[PDB]
Design a protein around this ligand. Structure first.
Ligand SMILES: *[C@@H]1O[C@H](CO)[C@@H](O[C@@H]2O[C@H](CO)[C@@H](O[C@@H]3O[C@H](CO)[C@@H](O)[C@H](O[C@H]4O[C@H](CO)[C@@H](O)[C@H](O)[C@@H]4O[C@@H]4O[C@H](CO)[C@@H](O[C@@H]5O[C@H](CO)[C@H](O)[C@H](O[C@]6(C(=O)O)C[C@H](O)[C@@H](NC(C)=O)[C@H]([C@H](O)[C@H](O)CO)O6)[C@H]5O)[C@H](O)[C@H]4NC(C)=O)[C@@H]3O)[C@H](O)[C@H]2NC(C)=O)[C@H](O)[C@H]1NC(C)=O
Ligand SMILES: *[C@@H]1O[C@H](CO)[C@@H](O[C@@H]2O[C@H](CO)[C@@H](O[C@@H]3O[C@H](CO)[C@@H](O)[C@H](O[C@H]4O[C@H](CO)[C@@H](O)[C@H](O)[C@@H]4O[C@@H]4O[C@H](CO)[C@@H](O[C@@H]5O[C@H](CO)[C@H](O)[C@H](O[C@]6(C(=O)O)C[C@H](O)[C@@H](NC(C)=O)[C@H]([C@H](O)[C@H](O)CO)O6)[C@H]5O)[C@H](O)[C@H]4NC(C)=O)[C@@H]3O)[C@H](O)[C@H]2NC(C)=O)[C@H](O)[C@H]1NC(C)=O
Ligand SMILES: *[C@@H]1O[C@H](CO)[C@@H](O[C@@H]2O[C@H](CO)[C@@H](O[C@@H]3O[C@H](CO)[C@@H](O)[C@H](O[C@H]4O[C@H](CO)[C@@H](O)[C@H](O)[C@@H]4O[C@@H]4O[C@H](CO)[C@@H](O[C@@H]5O[C@H](CO)[C@H](O)[C@H](O[C@]6(C(=O)O)C[C@H](O)[C@@H](NC(C)=O)[C@H]([C@H](O)[C@H](O)CO)O6)[C@H]5O)[C@H](O)[C@H]4NC(C)=O)[C@@H]3O)[C@H](O)[C@H]2NC(C)=O)[C@H](O)[C@H]1NC(C)=O
Ligand SMILES: *[C@@H]1O[C@H](CO)[C@@H](O)[C@H](O)[C@H]1NC(C)=O
Ligand SMILES: *[C@@H]1O[C@H](CO)[C@@H](O)[C@H](O)[C@H]1NC(C)=O
Ligand SMILES: *[C@@H]1O[C@H](CO)[C@@H](O)[C@H](O)[C@H]1NC(C)=O
Ligand SMILES: *[C@@H]1O[C@H](CO)[C@@H](O)[C@H](O)[C@H]1NC(C)=O
Ligand SMILES: *[C@@H]1O[C@H](CO)[C@@H](O)[C@H](O)[C@H]1NC(C)=O
Ligand SMILES: *[C@@H]1O[C@H](CO)[C@@H](O)[C@H](O)[C@H]1NC(C)=O
Ligand SMILES: *[C@@H]1O[C@H](CO)[C@@H](O)[C@H](O)[C@H]1NC(C)=O
Ligand SMILES: *[C@@H]1O[C@H](CO)[C@@H](O)[C@H](O)[C@H]1NC(C)=O
Ligand SMILES: *[C@@H]1O[C@H](CO)[C@@H](O)[C@H](O)[C@H]1NC(C)=O
Ligand SMILES: *[C@@H]1O[C@H](CO)[C@@H](O)[C@H](O)[C@H]1NC(C)=O
Ligand SMILES: *[C@@H]1O[C@H](CO)[C@@H](O)[C@H](O)[C@H]1NC(C)=O
Ligand SMILES: *[C@@H]1O[C@H](CO)[C@@H](O)[C@H](O)[C@H]1NC(C)=O
Lengths: 171, 320, 171, 320, 171, 320
């Protein structure tokens, strides 16, 4: 919610988009179908997988909780051992619980920032040739074929060719 | 004619925890906590564990007449016994450094019981009469199998001069003990010596014991006590025993042939004819999760223990 | 300071606004008074209260610091106990101090991001009908009554009605 | 005709700590650290604590003649005593497992002192003459109240045959001791037996003691020593005493009637006729803060201890 | 990468800019040379130095790892001591390694957010008088001397004077 | 005619670690881990350490004939010795509370050895013949320098009545011992007393020792044992020794004149004629880094130990 894209900016995710995590509702006279950004999703999946794997990797070394026996006259040492046992389990439980809580923010912020990043990437390429709306959708001033849809996805939008068309249409 | 941006949305109900917002629904989440177990005792890497059927570690080592199924045991992965074993020191007494011995036994996977001192090495004492009803067998007076209670023979008790080489290549665990009588007449009626002693001498051990002839209270019907002692005899090291009476002479020692890692586990679960990498007093973790919350004490390939009821790491986006 | 709204973007907070945390200096011919966004402030208060409560909730389980007595010949065990006592207090002090430090960033970033979020929410509704300035203030191209002030607050701004007025005024 | 966005600003000077910027002024902040206390000893949940007025735990249990205000004590929430109590083992000596006994006493909230062995049970020994000046009362030779120093009577010291059932439903704490003489003449002039012993026998305890007649240095004017011993007698368990001399016979035992939680606290603070949920050797925390920095040792409902001088959690925005 | 400026938005840093960390490739008819923002860099350096110093300051109090000797019959106490030794070293190693990992995100995010902040600061001053491009570069509609370059750096851009020039040029 | 924004880029290859992306190149980075050391033993704050050349702490204190270079030692910063010193209790036996003594010696920086009991104080015993071959010197029977093995003189062994004031202003460490014989003839042939004792009495110490005449195994060619004991005599406190035989009488005590902080370090590294603030069994840290990974045990001004192979804190931006 820090970057304010996934939660509040765009009302909700698309239920019919099953490939990847971040996609493009390309609407055109040829067809109104969904899509997905392979490059953005893959690095998002790579980052999440790296985060969880590194979390597990750094958590393989903790306290082993070895049990010991003490007689009736060694209650002080037994309590000395018992409190260490609980003390090490308490901090490791605190470390595990807190790490999940903080990383949950980062994972959701990472997902929140990504949609904001893909939001900006399309906006910076399209510039004035597209009318930006309250939702994540961009209403193109100029009609274009599926070539322009995939050009936006590929990151190789041809601005000067469509700049004149938008200027002529706008009055 | 318009492009748009959104994210993946599914119909799942996975929930994650965030310090500023509880109960957050996400599209995809990964559970990192294991909360399930088979619920039965299960083999560790294909090695059958040593299961003491209501018997204690000291009773097994000393040869409890009831615990006679452990006369010869194979290699084990860990030792499991009940929290309060009924068969434990049938004759009232104590085992010195019992907790230290259990710690030492936690890293031994096999014993090769050998007859270091045969029963034919006592031609001037009495091996037959050392029987109690605190240690009964098939309802007959009997006594611990691995040690010998020596009684006076022909109204005499000559001083014991016993020495033993550790010619083996492995450490030998030797168990002996001392018997504390009740009164002076009992002492002379069973040992013939009023003032007795037990001196044990090794390279590192110099011990002298004197019985405490006092008045105690009936435990298992007996007001007498027997304190048992143990030592680890190194290879090429000799052990010497000199006693005037009250001697529970060793008969069987234990070779430490395999010395790996193990635990002594307290659980009342039954065997299940199973095969697991990590064991638990409650059950066995058949998973490769980062964390688990079954029991802190775990042997084998074990995930980390935490005291949290749930641990879910968010992977996908918010489900909305 | 990460989102750069509360600290540097807008010069400072309003001293005369005493209700809530995030508000709107609605300036109009009828009256130049302050306001506050109940929805944005409440979720900000809810998040902060949830953060501090959960911090306390996860901090109720730490080491109890049980005292023990040792004689003159047990100095090794006493030092063994003393170092555990100090060691557990050191890590818990480190955990408490560091958690406050990190959560102080998140709380200030959360407040910084919120004003940026309310900044974007008004901008995305107003679009070209309002002239955006260097401060957080938006200079409307078209004059409007207090109805438009509360419409912006409610999130139900009527764009098409005022779009023609702004276009006619702009030359 | 223009809308604008800003945030709440006040005139407060609350400051928070950020790892990248110290001394940050915020509009609203919440303090999570408690740095104040009443400074007086204060009742725990309405129960008056056991305050030892310059007396030790061992002196109270053994019946120090000076510490006679604790002859009958009510239920207490915790035990508080000075760091170096002057009244502690008025006669030179030691209490065996004194630290273990204090740990055991940390979970007892009430004792019911009973006369297990009356003074009329020694018709052949001398209860009257066991008085020292290391333990004076109103400036007169005297001795510990809860135990009896037995002296030879009519130039004789018959062997003691004392047994006691624990017919009660609660554990009984029994205190006895052994006196170490200085020379052989002192031993025969006060006990009539050169070679003495003390044998104590219970279900779990088998103890024999022999005095160490040596030459030591004057402590409290006495070159003699007295070593005291304790045991916990279980219900329906008998305790037996056999002694030839040097016996400090028990007279009063202690019933463990209430067994909860408590601490033994070292502080020189005075009582304040107060009422607190959590106590501290320095004072009492009258707050519900998440954290405090008064003292690590705390009894009752206590906030967490940290070694930080300040802990402020930012709640409002930056004040600028 | 959260704020998406240093990593993906602008292709890469400038190799020839050796002063400070954040700078301005001022291109003009007088000369195309590099520059640096002293105010933005200094507070970035101050924040980074404060972060590392405070990390060291809060890490001066950890476990001392005092060695002790135990005989053959005290293996339980020796193992009791050995596990505490390792347990305290494990958590402190986890604390040190994790703190570096998390602070590495914050430091890179702080650097990522700063370039985004300097990106917004120039954009909000320049407004429509400059044509914003896909990279971090701003193409001015009106030509201006090095005075305007340093005016943007100083944060005292004169908008009304150049607003008329841009409007006349734009058609 | 255009302004632009970017960041500093250099040609360095510094790499940092991020939990979501390994191996990230940055323009500027700060290393916070120290992985280098001089590799030699080095002085601590200009004070030469006490280096035991293949000698043990007990052998140095008892005066091992081989370890004669430590007869008079100057002030030291720490004690360093090999993991398995060959010169350690040349005569077979043990030192009671040896681990406790080493802990006590860890906070002593200087000793002033004094002749508390001169050799002329034994006119009725034999100081000359207490020589063994388990403790040889220049290939001749010899014995520990700091204690005296007393033998019977003129076929007699009068009881020892030895007392000593601690008139000094510092604590005195006194080392004595007891010799355990092999058989009854050896006892009468060397001590003339079959039943012997050793009683030591101070303000806080009341000890009685009886030799254990048993049969043990040859250690260093001797089946006899010697158990050594130590005490800390407080100022103005007297120590008394009463012995009938088997007494290893003290000859030299140790004044605790300087009592600071130090460690007992196990390393086989050689001296290097150096000067360091923090020492390590592996080497010496000549740096002011926040962290190091050389060895957990470190004396002096020492950085924190972590078990990480690398620790780099990112300072500059990403290098791309
Ligand atoms: C405090 O509270 C307790 C209760 O909690 C009270 O206890 C109570 O005491 C009263 C006293 O009168 C009891 O009254 C009784 O009334 C009932 C009913 O009438 C009687 O049955 C009771 O009889 C007992 O005392 C009688 C007194 O006249 C005796 O005549 C009678 O014989 C009996 O005493 C016991 O007798 C049995 C007979 O078999 C003895 O058994 C054998 O004795 C041997 C010698 O001691 C051995 O101990 C032997 O054990 C063996 C073995 O281990 O198997 C044999 C073996 O061969 C040996 N091995 C070898 C190698 O030699 C070993 C070996 O010798 C030993 O191991 C060495 O250590 O031994 C054993 O089978 C008993 O020993 C003998 N009693 C003993 C222990 O001496 C009695 O009249 C109450 O019933 C009683 N209540 C209880 C107990 O709950 C106290 O009174 C209370 N105190 C006060 C002040 O009130
Ligand atoms: C090392 O350093 C120290 C100093 O730190 C030096 O010590 C010094 O030693 C010299 C030796 O000459 C002293 O010189 C003295 O000079 C002054 C001035 O002239 C004298 O006052 C000193 O007198 C002492 O020694 C005299 C030798 O002639 C004696 O004649 C004289 O009597 C005195 O000895 C003590 O006398 C008192 C008299 O009351 C004895 O009191 C009673 O003795 C009883 C038997 O021992 C009991 O101990 C009794 O205690 C009671 C009790 O507890 O109350 C009585 C009670 O009834 C009993 N209870 C029962 C149930 O029976 C109990 C019970 O028996 C016991 O508890 C059992 O354990 O006992 C007690 O009141 C003293 O006992 C007796 N002394 C003892 C302890 O034997 C002397 O001439 C210096 O003054 C002295 N300096 C000091 C101490 O600071 C060493 O010299 C130094 N070493 C060297 C080599 O230089
Ligand atoms: C179990 O396994 C072990 C092996 O691991 C086996 O051991 C083996 O036992 C057999 C038994 O026959 C041995 O056989 C041998 O064969 C060889 C070759 O023929 C012989 O050399 C062996 O000789 C030994 O036994 C002979 C028996 O006839 C003796 O005649 C012969 O003398 C020798 O015994 C030893 O003799 C030496 C001579 O110097 C003695 O030395 C001196 O003795 C003194 C009295 O004991 C002192 O001990 C003295 O030490 C000093 C000192 O410390 O320096 C002197 C000093 O003056 C004193 N100081 C003062 C102040 O007085 C101190 C002081 O008294 C003490 O410190 C007090 O504590 O003492 C010392 O120099 C030896 O003592 C004496 N032996 C002893 C220790 O009594 C023998 O015939 C095998 O060789 C042997 N194998 C081994 C050992 O590896 C067992 O057999 C196995 N068990 C079974 C059932 O098979
Ligand atoms: C453009 O996108 C299409 C997806 O249909 C892909 O196959 C093609 O490789 C892309 N081309 C470039 C240059 O990225
Ligand atoms: C599962 O998802 C589909 C859309 O993919 C949706 O129509 C359906 O309602 C979902 N199932 C449930 C139980 O909500
Ligand atoms: C989250 O849901 C669980 C079960 O659905 C419930 O017990 C818990 O109270 C919820 N947490 C909230 C409402 O904060
Ligand atoms: C469980 O055990 C089986 C065989 O015992 C094994 O193949 C499997 O990998 C284990 N783990 C899981 C998660 O099934
Ligand atoms: C619009 O805002 C006013 C505040 O004056 C509020 O009373 C009203 O409920 C809001 N209406 C809607 C539809 O949000
Ligand atoms: C308190 O705040 C008011 C504005 O609400 C301000 O005028 C006043 O100066 C402040 N007080 C101080 C002491 O600054
Ligand atoms: C913050 O203020 C306190 C007291 O006002 C002062 O002691 C401390 O040095 C300040 N911290 C800084 C200037 O970093
Ligand atoms: C302090 O004690 C009083 C009564 O003793 C109680 O009412 C109050 O809740 C406690 N806490 C505070 C913060 O006043
Ligand atoms: C403007 O920038 C120049 C840099 O050349 C600097 O010397 C001058 O002080 C700045 N003026 C102001 C008002 O910031
Ligand atoms: C060092 O940096 C310069 C630019 O400052 C670059 O030209 C050179 O190639 C770099 N060195 C290497 C080895 O890459
Ligand atoms: C990072 O680089 C090191 C050495 O250059 C290499 O060992 C390690 O595998 C790399 N990490 C990756 C590729 O994740
Ligand atoms: C290393 O030692 C020298 C002298 O011994 C000292 O001047 C220097 O400060 C130390 N540290 C470093 C990093 O050189």
């Amino acid at each position: 919610g820090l970057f304010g894209a996934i939660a509040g900016f765009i009302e909700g995710g698309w239920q019919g988009m099953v490939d990847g995590w971040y996609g493009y509702h390309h609407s055109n006279e040829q067809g109104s179908g969904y899509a997905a950004d392979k490059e953005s999703t893959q690095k998002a999946i790579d980052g999440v997988t790296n985060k969880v794997n590194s979390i597990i990797d750094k958590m393989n070394t903790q306290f082993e909780a070895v049990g010991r026996e003490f007689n009736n006259l060694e209650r002080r040492i037994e309590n000395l051992n018992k409190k260490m046992e609980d003390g090490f389990l308490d901090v490791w439980t605190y470390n595990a619980e807190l790490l999940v809580l903080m990383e949950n923010e980062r994972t959701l912020d990472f997902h929140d920032s990504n949609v904001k990043n893909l939001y900006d990437k399309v906006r910076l390429q399209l510039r004035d040739n597209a009318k930006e709306l309250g939702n994540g959708c961009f209403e193109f001033y100029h009609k274009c074929d599926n070539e322009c849809m995939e050009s936006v996805r590929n990151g190789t939008y041809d601005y000067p060719q469509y700049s004149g068309e938008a200027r002529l249409k706008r009055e | 004619d318009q492009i748009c941006i959104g994210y993946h949305a599914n119909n799942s109900t996975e929930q994650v925890d965030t310090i500023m917002e509880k109960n957050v629904t996400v599209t995809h989440a990964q559970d990192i906590l294991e909360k399930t177990h088979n619920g039965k005792l299960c083999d560790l890497n294909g090695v059958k564990p040593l299961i003491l059927k209501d018997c204690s570690v000291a009773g097994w080592l000393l040869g409890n007449p009831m615990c006679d199924e452990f006369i010869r045991v194979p290699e084990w992965s860990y030792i499991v016994e009940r929290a309060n074993p009924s068969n434990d020191l049938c004759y009232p007494g104590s085992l010195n450094d019992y907790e230290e011995l259990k710690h030492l036994l936690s890293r031994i996977n096999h014993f090769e019981k050998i007859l270091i001192i045969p029963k034919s090495s006592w031609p001037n004492h009495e091996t037959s009469l050392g029987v109690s009803a605190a240690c009964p067998y098939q309802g007959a007076p009997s006594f611990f199998r691995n040690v010998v209670w020596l009684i006076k023979k022909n109204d005499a008790y000559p001083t014991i001069k016993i020495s033993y080489n550790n010619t083996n290549q492995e450490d030998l665990l030797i168990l002996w003990g001392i018997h504390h009588s009740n009164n002076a007449e009992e002492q002379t009626n069973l040992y013939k010596n009023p003032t007795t002693y037990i001196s044990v001498g090794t390279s590192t051990l110099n011990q002298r014991l004197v019985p405490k002839i006092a008045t105690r209270s009936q435990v298992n019907g007996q007001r007498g006590r027997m304190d048992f002692f143990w030592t680890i005899l190194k290879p090429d090291d000799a052990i010497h025993f000199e006693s005037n009476g009250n001697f529970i002479a060793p008969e069987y020692a234990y070779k430490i042939v395999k010395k790996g890692d193990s635990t002594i586990m307290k659980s009342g679960v039954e065997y299940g004819h199973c095969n697991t990498k990590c064991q638990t007093p409650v059950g066995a973790i058949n998973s490769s999760m980062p964390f688990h919350n079954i029991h802190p004490l775990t042997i084998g390939e074990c995930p980390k223990y935490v005291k949290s009821n749930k641990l879910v790491l968010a992977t996908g986006l918010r489900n909305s």
